[PDB]
A = this chain, B = another copy of it.
């Protein structure tokens, strides 16, 4: 019944049928993206209309299309031909990944480079990586992938332990031609294996860990209705899934007494970029847009009970489309459970004699994706006290290179001859805010130090200041950890009982933003990553901080173009875009498989409630 329900297999089958009969899904066609559209802004919107947006690739070389279809009515709403030299290429297709290694295997330049290194071509794996936009004029308007080589000594070997440095190839995956093979010189291929299940490397497994049993004898405290609507400890929300963004949270609201109060209309990780900082021409082009170029939802893992998700787990199994429009279920792709979270509030009062302790809990919604060597967990947390938090967990295998004999300023050494280039992992959270409704504004809050003097004779005073961001041209902000900078999203038309506007405070981790030179290709294409906070006026078609078609787009799309409209954001329907990331100088302990590291952000109530919202939590 809900317009925010997960897409079903039947809906995807109907989209396939509509496209086929319209002549848009012949045998040369591939679906590169398919997803449901959110309802347009309408508090009186009643008529059910489920619409899907589709990107259609053509393997014969014809122009791709963007298509919108109504599943409810069985109609094509619009279909537009794309000029990819102008607006960007379509996301990378899973089936194009295999093409790179196969094409190189019969290319004479590639074979000569391998023969010089005495490598068997049947043992050489090629990582197919996005191309970006650099100096090669012949690439404009063509779908290019670049390939880096790794040796697999046997079928179960970790090829990441054996990079083939000094070699890179560029491939046109539509015309199926190898455009360039660059061989800058022979580097020894690192010889140690990195097989983390080999007993020779692990040694004897520990026998010291005793079980931790986490159970809910009465079942969980949350309810799931209509497939994806969650109610838990005054929270209300809908859990969506999109093949590009992954888990999306809709309609986050909090039931305060008799009233359901909105907080966030839509929360997602709208882009994720992994830029590499090695100036070698073998890798200086390397930048993954995992969300925009690869689509993180389509590589979501099936999560196994007792290993990936521990406790009383409720699973969702989202459905996506394959390249031909058939539905594909991601079994157990989303874990939902509640977790104990220590002490919530505690006080032992001498004067009253009352001893008071209460425990905290959080609701966890998570999924895990795998893109080549890296694995990322995406965690959303809801706490009893109104806090909302996101956490990304990075693990997997680090991307490797040779370690040059005379050291390096841009690569760390992991093992003899084995390097790991410096890189970042930078996320963009898109928060379509709805603090008590859609009339919102953002204030920047800094600590203010005060000088000893009149009115501050002991030199102890300190204060704070708030600056309203009133237009998009002034809403591109930088962190300042030294002054305790945070941002408050408030509703100027909704006051608490003290006659102050209700609000929520965003607490950032204040990690470094994009390090690349401001003139670089990556700084132009990932402009969102150069600043910590952006605020835009809501618009239906401003979905991603990098634009709709990220692959091989020349730059400037997304947030810089949106902000240029300079719209009023002072008491309006606004969107907060928060950049946050990890700067990774790999350490020896990251090899041969990396222990999890984390980064995130949180939002806490700031005068949203009239007092603590957890006074009604029992002692239990």
A residues 203-242 in Cβ contact with B at 8 Å: 203-221, 233
Contact A606 B587, beta carbon cutoff 8 Å: yes
A494 CB-CB contact with B under 8 Å:
no
Taking a contact as CB atoms under 8 Å apart, the answer to whether B460 and A484 are in contact is no
On whether the beta carbons of B520 and A459 are closer than 8 Å, the reply is yes
CA distance A359 to B618 in the complex (A): 31
A375 to B360, CA, bound (A): 16
- Tally of this chain's copies: 2
Name the segment of A15-23, A30-38, A170-178, A446-454 touching the other chain. A446-454
* Complexed CA–CA distance, A203 and B159 (Å): 61
Interface window among A107-115, A338-346, A426-434, A570-578 = A338-346
Against B, the Cβ 8 Å flags (1 = close, 0 = not) of A266-279 are 00000000011111
CB distance from A313 to the nearest CB of B (A): 13
* CA gap between A60 and B591 in the complex, in Å: 66
Known: A156-B354, A451-B517, A512-B447. A338 touches B233 (CB 8 A): no
Q: Indicate which residue in B157, B220, B591 contacts A611 across the interface (CB closer than 8 Å).
A: B591
Chain A 447-481 residues near chain B, CB threshold 8 A: 447, 449-452, 455-464, 479, 481
Query: Which residue of B is nearest A482, CB measured?
Result: B512
With a cutoff of 8 Å between Cβ atoms, the chain B residues found around residue A344 in the complex are 595-596
- Which residues of B have CB within 8 Å of A354? 156, 197
Interface size of A as a range: 35 or more
Please, how many angstroms separate the alpha-carbon atoms of A594 and B612 in the complex? Answer: 7
Say what secondary structure dominates the interface of chain A.
loop
List 28 A-B pairs, Cβ < 8 Å.
Answer: A158-B352, A196-B612, A196-B615, A197-B356, A203-B257, A205-B618, A209-B361, A211-B218, A275-B460, A285-B458, A287-B460, A343-B368, A343-B393, A346-B377, A350-B372, A356-B593, A360-B596, A385-B589, A409-B461, A410-B462, A415-B611, A452-B519, A456-B517, A587-B606, A589-B604, A590-B612, A591-B611, A592-B615
Q: Are A593 and B620 in contact (CB under 8 A)?
A: no
Contact yes or no, B452 A520, CB < 8 A? yes
Considering only residues 395-422 of chain A, those with a C-beta below 8 Å from chain B are 395-397, 409-410, 413, 415-416, 422
CB pair A209 B517 closer than 8 Å = no
Distance between Cα atoms of A253 and B510 in the complex (Å): 32
Distance A204 CA – B587 CA, assembled complex (angstroms):
53
Q: A278-B460, A344-B596, A447-B515 are in contact. List 12 more A-B contacts (CB 8 A).
A: A156-B353, A203-B615, A204-B616, A213-B214, A277-B461, A310-B359, A343-B393, A356-B593, A385-B589, A385-B595, A481-B482, A496-B588
A316 to B595, CA, bound (A): 32
The B-contacting residues of A in range 600-614, CB under 8 angstroms, are 604-614
Rounded to whole Å, the gap between the CB of A156 and the closest CB of chain B is: 5
Considering only CB atoms, which chain B residue lies closest to A458 in the complex? Answer: B284
* Contacting pair A460 B159 (CB below 8 A): no
Contact of A618 among B209, B308, B482, B604 (CB under 8 A): B209
In the complex, whether A41 has a CB less than 8 A from a CB of chain B is no
Q: How far is the CB of A103 from chain B (nearest CB, A)?
A: 17
Q: A284-B460, A510-B481 are in contact. Are A351 and B125 (CB under 8 A)?
A: yes
B213 & A216 in contact (Cβ 8 Å cutoff): yes
Query: Contact check: which of B352, B456, B583 meets A447 at CB < 8 Å?
Result: B583
Task: Say yes or no for A347: interface residue by CB 8 A criterion.
Answer: yes
Chain B, residue nearest A613 (CB)? B589
Mark each residue of chain A from 177 to 207: 1 if its CB lies under 8 Å from any CB of chain B, else 0. Answer: 0000000000000000000110001111111
> Quick check: A459 and B340 within 8 Å, CB to CB?
no
- A370 proximal to B (CB < 8 A): yes
Cα-based distance from A66 to B163 in the complex (angstroms) = 65
Residues in B whose Cβ lies below 8 Å from that of A368: 343, 346
Given contacts A416-B498, A614-B595, contact A510 B510 (CB under 8 A): yes
Q: Let me know if B348 and A517 touch, CB within 8 A.
A: no
Given A347-B370, A520-B458: A484 and B218 interface contact (C-beta under 8 Å):
no
Known: A159-B351, A217-B213, A301-B348. A615 touches B308 (CB 8 A): no
Is A130 part of the contact surface with B, judged by Cβ < 8 Å? no
Say whether, besides A208-B233, A512-B484, A618-B206, A215 and B218 are in contact (CB < 8 Å).
no
Q: How close is A231's CB to chain B, nearest CB, in angstroms?
A: 9
Contact B125 A595 (CB under 8 A): no
> In the complex, what distance in Å separates the CA atom of A359 from the CA atom of B339?
16
Enumerate chain B residues within 8 angstroms of A605, measured Cβ to Cβ. Answer: 587, 589
In contact, B214 and A159 (Cβ under 8 angstroms):
no
Whether A134 sits at the interface, judged by CB under 8 Å, is yes
The residues of B that contact A158 with a CB separation of less than 8 Å are 349, 352
- Is A357's CB within 8 Å of the partner chain B? yes
Query: Contacts of A306 on B, CB cut-off 8 Å?
Result: 620
A619 within 8 A of B: yes
The reply to whether A214 and B214 contact each other, CB–CB distance below 8 Å, is yes
- Shortest A252–chain B CB gap in Å is 17
Q: Is A511 an interface residue (CB 8 A)?
A: yes
Q: How far is the CA of A211 from the CA of B217 in the complex (A)?
A: 7
- Inter-subunit contact B345/A278 (CB<8 Å): no
- Beta-carbon contact of B202 and A615 below 8 Å: yes
A96 to B515, CA, bound (A): 57
Chain B min CB distance to A425 (Å): 13
The answer, yes or no, to whether A516 is at the interface (CB within 8 Å) is: yes
